[PDB]
């Protein structure tokens, strides 16, 4: 009360050494109120995480294969802390695995069988872990032992580690299948070697490792890589033609316990101490006891891991797939029929009761699964548990950040070809009410505020994004007084007027009454000074048509737009004045779904669209009551996007800028996260 010395596991006896080598050196140069290091010793890693799961260690640092064994259950470790190995101004930690051909070879990712393979090793993830598991349902039967399976797809390969006398196989081209860089064709430099030379045909490797063996271009243009859309792209194309991003070497700590910030804590302040051309004393990647002791030896820094990132996250979908499929043999049995059913992402209770009766009018097509906030949602679509859910634009931008397509949009514009025709979007506008005659969109410091939420397009990023543009700082809740913008840290003044209890108090879903366009705008009658929503919202609200309690006799009269000019008009002007055009909301998926989804949701809508009437009874997908439960309530139809299928692409170049200019402001745990893997 308080402990600060980070217990950290050590595997060799010379790692060990370094441990208190580097404990020794620490309590040198940091002070009595920071971090020390203490060292446990285990006879293997697989020892180590399941010491640090029980208490008795706290961090170790892990490749990629062993950060999924430790976030397994019962060991539930995260990963916490990243080394990295490039420059201090664009630092490398994550490496993308590849399968590198040589030009004009004619055939694809689903023509490797019969072909000569050049791998890293065995365990490797590149060199094997993604390739093999994400070829493993297309190995012959049986698949176990691996190894005679791999054998007996490929025509001959060199498989580094693996063993020649009981599959000889895989040594055609490396005779004696050895685990050392004695053989020509060990690890990424000498896999590539294989296919440089003739001996195979494909290689798994790293994208950086061509660059590290042909610094020319000229020669780089004699390979290409393999896409898994079983097409080919040129070299320097890695980032979108790649099989899997492996994370290259990571500290993980216990989910619950941690101490995680405590263990950055002592690492930061280890590489400014010892880093990196740092001290003649001690040397953090280096030693005297034999080499990659702790960390590795090419390792160049730390950085921490966003909080967001659950290894799942960190790891990624294709790598999780793949090292999946390696230990449980689930294929389909035999072959998988067409489309099964989609798992659409509830938001809380409230979507989810709908969409569970969506579900049961879809006989078995689709399936219902919940998350709390959106980002929650976001990420389950993007680690398989989710595959598809409806989002504003501002969300969506960030599901494209997070690697997820948009594959419909919704529609507002009541049209004989709703289905097939591209709107231009819809319009963000700021509500006051007549009565409140002294404010101006100039005027508004200090003024009260109600948001759909943040991150949200007409709530958030364009109002804000505009502010910002003005007033040159984040701190949006100093300038307000206070407002509701669901989503904010929950001891901000963008909380205060928010109407949740206790828990749900400001939080981005609907147990909190002013989420979404509605409560916004209810927030604006009973609490703020100003609402920021849809140029919609009011009518939809107004005149009887909403029947709640509290906007039962509100007037579209009471009600008027701030323009951009410093005038004010009524609000069926909003053409007149808005504040910016918002990309319409739209679906989005990962992209081995965006084709059954987009087959799934037009059979669906013919169905439970905005064509069938007498609603009550029957089910009908785009009304909700007045909370926008799964879709928008005013969503005519979905449409479809030919070629508008990438969020830049989708939400276009304006909103794409915007959102951009907001970056430095952002507090969102996902896009940070996301952008972490990479933007
Ligand atoms: C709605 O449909 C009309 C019909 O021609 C079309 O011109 C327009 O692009 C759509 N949007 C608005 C706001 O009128
Ligand atoms: C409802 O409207 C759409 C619009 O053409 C139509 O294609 C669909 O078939 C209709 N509903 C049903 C249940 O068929
Ligand atoms: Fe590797
Ligand atoms: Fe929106």
Redesign the pocket.
């Known amino acids: 009360v308080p402990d600060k010395t980070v217990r950290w596991c050590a595997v060799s006896e010379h790692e060990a050494t370094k441990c208190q080598s580097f404990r020794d050196h620490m309590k040198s140069v940091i002070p009595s109120d920071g971090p020390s290091v203490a060292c446990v010793k285990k006879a293997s890693y697989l020892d180590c995480i399941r010491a640090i799961a029980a208490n008795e260690a706290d961090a170790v640092t892990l490749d990629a294969g062993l950060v999924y064994d430790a976030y397994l259950a019962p060991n539930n470790l995260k990963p916490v802390v990243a080394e990295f190995y490039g420059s201090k101004e664009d630092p490398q930690t994550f490496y993308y695995a590849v399968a590198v051909v040589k030009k004009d070879s004619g055939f694809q990712m689903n023509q490797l069988r019969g072909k000569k393979s050049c791998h890293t090793g065995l365990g490797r993830s590149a060199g094997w872990n993604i390739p093999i598991g994400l070829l493993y349902c297309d190995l012959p039967e049986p698949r176990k032992p691996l190894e005679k399976a791999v054998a007996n797809f490929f025509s001959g390969s060199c498989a580094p580690c693996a063993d020649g006398t009981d599959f000889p196989q895989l040594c055609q081209l490396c005779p004696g299948c050895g685990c050392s860089t004695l053989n020509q064709y060990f690890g990424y430099s000498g896999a590539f070697k294989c296919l440089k030379d003739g001996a195979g045909d494909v290689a798994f490797v790293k994208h950086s490792t061509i660059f590290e063996n042909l610094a020319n271009k000229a020669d780089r243009d004699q390979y290409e890589l393999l896409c898994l859309d079983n097409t080919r792209k040129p070299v320097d194309e890695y980032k979108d033609c790649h099989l899997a991003q492996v994370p290259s070497h990571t500290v993980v700590a216990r989910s619950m316990g941690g101490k995680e910030d405590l263990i950055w804590e002592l690492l930061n302040q280890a590489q400014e101490h010892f880093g990196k051309d740092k001290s003649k004393e001690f040397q953090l990647f280096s030693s005297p006891h034999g080499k990659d002791l702790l960390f590795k030896d090419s390792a160049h820094g730390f950085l921490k891991v966003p909080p967001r990132m659950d290894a799942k996250m960190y790891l990624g979908y294709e790598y999780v797939t793949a090292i999946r499929n390696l230990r449980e043999g689930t294929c389909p049995e035999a072959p998988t029929d067409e489309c099964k059913p989609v798992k659409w992402c509830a938001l809380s209770h409230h979507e989810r009761l709908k969409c569970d009766e969506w579900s049961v009018n879809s006989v078995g097509k689709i399936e219902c699964v919940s998350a709390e906030t959106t980002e929650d949602c976001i990420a389950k679509i993007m680690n398989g548990e989710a595959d598809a859910m409806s989002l504003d634009g501002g969300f969506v931008y960030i599901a494209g950040k997070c690697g997820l397509v948009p594959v419909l949009a919704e529609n507002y514009n009541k049209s004989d070809n709703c289905?097939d025709t591209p709107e231009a979007g819809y319009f963000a506008v700021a509500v006051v009410k007549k009565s409140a005659s002294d404010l101006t969109w100039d005027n508004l410091k200090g003024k009260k505020s109600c948001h759909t939420a943040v991150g949200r397009t007409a709530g958030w990023n364009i109002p804000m994004g505009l502010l910002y543009n003005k007033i040159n700082h984040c701190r949006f809740d100093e300038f307000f007084s206070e407002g509701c913008a669901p989503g904010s840290k929950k001891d901000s003044s963008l909380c205060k007027l928010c109407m949740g209890s206790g828990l749900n108090l400001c939080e981005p879903n609907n147990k909190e009454g002013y989420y979404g366009y509605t409560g916004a705008f209810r927030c604006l009658v009973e609490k703020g000074d100003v609402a920021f929503v849809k140029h919609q919202t009011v009518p939809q609200n107004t005149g009887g048509k909403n029947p709640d309690p509290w906007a039962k006799n509100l007037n579209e009269k009471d009600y008027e737009l701030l323009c951009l000019d410093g005038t004010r008009k009524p609000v069926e002007e909003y053409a007149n004045c808005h504040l910016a055009r918002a990309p319409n909301h739209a679906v989005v998926t990962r992209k081995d779904k965006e084709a059954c989804v987009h087959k799934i949701l037009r059979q669906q809508q013919?169905?439970?669209?905005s064509?069938?009437t007498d609603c009550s009874g029957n089910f009908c997908l785009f009304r909700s009551e007045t909370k926008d439960l799964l879709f928008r309530d005013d969503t005519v139809c979905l449409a479809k996007l030919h070629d508008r299928n990438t969020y830049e692409k989708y939400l276009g170049e304006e909103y794409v800028k915007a959102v951009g200019n907001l970056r430095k402001c952002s507090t969102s745990s996902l896009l940070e996260a996301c952008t972490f893997r990479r933007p």
Do not use: A, C, K, Q
């Open positions: 289905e013919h169905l439970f669209g064509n069938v």
